[PDB]
């Protein structure tokens, strides 16, 4: 309910479009069904993205690390062009949809056109593309951000530039970087059911041993014994 309310674009309430968009844009949105089908398809692919996130993140933790801070970039776009959120905007929803589409085309991690390269491109940028489509959806774009056309174009350009700056440079000794980044905290790890932790546990994990100090099975239950103390 909340997802559909906050993300599904509404093209059936004229009052909201008058409040959020200039009257020519409201007439354009309400008149032709092509743009309406495009926004419906936007919301549908966002629903499939939601299911993909649900299977990827079963624990429901929304915090995740990603290259470009979309919210801060939107804020910078707001305060560079002096966006007045109290007034209707002049940005087409369809322009937002096509802009995010062509931007996602421009963000390349693996290049090529055969099915293998295209599938790897989709998988490499799947999560960031989901985040981009959710953040720059025409609903939130027209409701809470209220960016103009030039501001939106500047935002797309900045996202492209920062993403290309975020790609790993070849020749980087990522192995030594990982070794040092995982070795530095070991100088800080200490040791306080009772389970072995700290540098002994890290030692055993890297010094693979047939004898754990505190071997264990965090075994779960599925039936009524999961909740029934007597059965468990």
């Amino acid at each position: 309910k909340a997802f559909e309310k906050k993300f599904r674009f509404d093209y059936t309430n004229e009052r909201a479009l008058r409040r959020t968009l200039q009257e020519d844009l409201v007439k354009d949105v309400l008149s032709n069904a092509h743009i309406q089908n495009e926004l419906e398809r936007e919301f549908e692919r966002m629903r499939e993205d939601r299911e993909v996130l649900r299977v990827i993140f079963p624990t429901g933790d929304s915090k995740v690390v990603l290259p470009c801070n979309l919210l801060r970039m939107i804020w910078n776009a707001q305060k560079i062009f002096h966006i007045n959120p109290r007034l209707p905007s002049d940005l087409h929803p369809i322009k937002v949809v096509e802009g995010v589409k062509e931007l996602s085309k421009k963000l390349v991690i693996v290049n090529g056109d055969d099915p293998l390269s295209r599938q790897a491109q989709e998988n490499a940028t799947l999560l960031f593309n989901i985040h981009l489509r959710s953040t720059l959806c025409s609903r939130r774009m027209a409701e809470e951000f209220r960016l103009s056309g030039e501001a939106f174009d500047w935002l797309l350009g900045e996202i492209e530039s920062k993403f290309n700056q975020a790609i790993a440079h070849p020749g980087e000794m990522v192995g030594a970087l990982a070794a040092q980044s995982l070795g530095e905290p070991a100088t800080q790890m200490t040791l306080n059911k009772n389970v072995t932790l700290g540098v002994p546990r890290l030692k055993e994990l890297i010094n693979i041993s047939k004898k754990p100090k505190t071997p264990s099975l965090t075994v779960f239950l599925l039936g009524q014994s999961a909740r029934d103390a007597e059965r468990a």
Partner: protein, 148 residues
């Protein structure tokens, strides 16, 4: 004129949540005419105000009372007639938020404008008609004078 807002307020509470800054107090004030709620951080050390006082408040875009823009830069040597001469307490800040009771269907009837005078914060709530002069990221001058 360049006066975005003017009223007479009375202080209804001085430091409600207990003293938290030994030189600054968060006055809560009411307006008898416009019925605006005002919260305003005032440096009591130089301009001491106690409970039940009354004061004319004015929020202005400029001080030269001619529409000439201030330039937002400190000019101690100003020969122009300043509006600040008619007031005891003068602060300079930037409106950084304009909230309201608007829905997606209808516009706001009530608006709340927040201003940050160098850190000293002010909020002014009331009906939307009197806060049309306020627009975000614009510089304002708060001019306050105690009334007998």
């Amino acid at each position: 004129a360049g006066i975005l807002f003017e009223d007479i307020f009375d202080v209804k509470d001085i430091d409600p949540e207990g003293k938290k800054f030994d030189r600054v107090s968060r006055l809560h004030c009411e307006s008898e005419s416009f019925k605006m709620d005002l919260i305003l951080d005032v440096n009591i050390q130089i301009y001491p105000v106690d409970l039940g006082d009354k004061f004319r408040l004015v929020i202005a875009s400029t001080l030269y009372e001619d529409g000439t823009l201030d330039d937002g830069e400190y000019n101690p040597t100003d020969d122009r007639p300043s509006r600040a001469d008619q007031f005891e307490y003068v602060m300079y800040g930037k409106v950084y938020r304009i909230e309201g009771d608007e829905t997606s269907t209808e516009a706001a009837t009530r608006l709340s404008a927040y201003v940050s005078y160098g850190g000293l914060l002010m909020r002014l709530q009331g009906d939307a008609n009197n806060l049309h002069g306020f627009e975000v990221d614009s510089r304002v001058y708060l001019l306050m004078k105690k009334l007998a």
